[PDB]
Amino acid sequence: KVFGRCELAAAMKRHGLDNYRGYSLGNWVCAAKFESNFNTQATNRNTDGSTDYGILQINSRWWCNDGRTPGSRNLCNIPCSALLSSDITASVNCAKKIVSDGNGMNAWVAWRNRCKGTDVQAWIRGCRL
């Protein structure tokens, strides 16, 4: 599923991400935009052999199981394929664990590099939330 901007913001809010660990909704929308372009089916292989999955590009070394990643811990206890669903619950549940791991949203390098410190509220501007 390719979400619309406000559509995703509403779905993230509906799943308790707005202000989760102090990160406003715009932060999450901005991270999704640059990680996946709002496409739940996005997958990207890393140099280390792990793969990133879904709207927030969750990795298969630490977080989900894809059966082909050496040293996988599967800390979200899910198959990585669950992170590609049109329903974002699994991605949101796991992102909550990731953002709680100690480094906040810096866990998403694209968030650090493209969203952190910017006017992230613009990502939810206009939306009926």
SS3 121: helix
Q: State yes or no: is 87 an active-site residue.
A: no
Among 7, 18, 48, 52, which one carries the catalytic annotation?
Answer: 52
The least distance separating Rb ion from the CB of residue 53, rounded to whole angstroms, comes to 16
Name the residues that contact Cl ion, by CB under 5 A. Answer: 104
Binding mask 68-87 for Rb ion (x = CB under 5 A): ------x-------------
The least distance separating Cl ion from the CB of residue 105, rounded to whole angstroms, comes to 7
Q: Give whichever of 74 and 93 is closer to Rb ion, judged by the CB atom.
A: 74
Sign of CA dihedral 24, 100, 70, 1: negative
Q: Are 32 and 54 in contact (CB under 8 A)?
A: no
Among 35, 48, 87, 119, which one carries the catalytic annotation?
Answer: 35
DSSP state of 80: G
Q: Give whichever of 27 and 60 is closer to Rb ion, judged by the CB atom.
A: 60
The least distance separating Rb ion from the CB of residue 12, rounded to whole angstroms, comes to 25
Task: State the Cα–Cα distance between residues 6 and 40, nearest whole angstrom.
Answer: 15
Task: State the Cα–Cα distance between residues 114 and 129, nearest whole angstrom.
Answer: 24
101 is in an annotated binding site: yes
Helix (H) or strand (E) holding 52: strand 51-53
Q: Give whichever of 56 and 78 is closer to Rb ion, judged by the CB atom.
A: 78
Enumerate the β-bridge partners of residue 79.
65
Known binding-site positions for substrate: 101
Catalytic residues: 35, 52
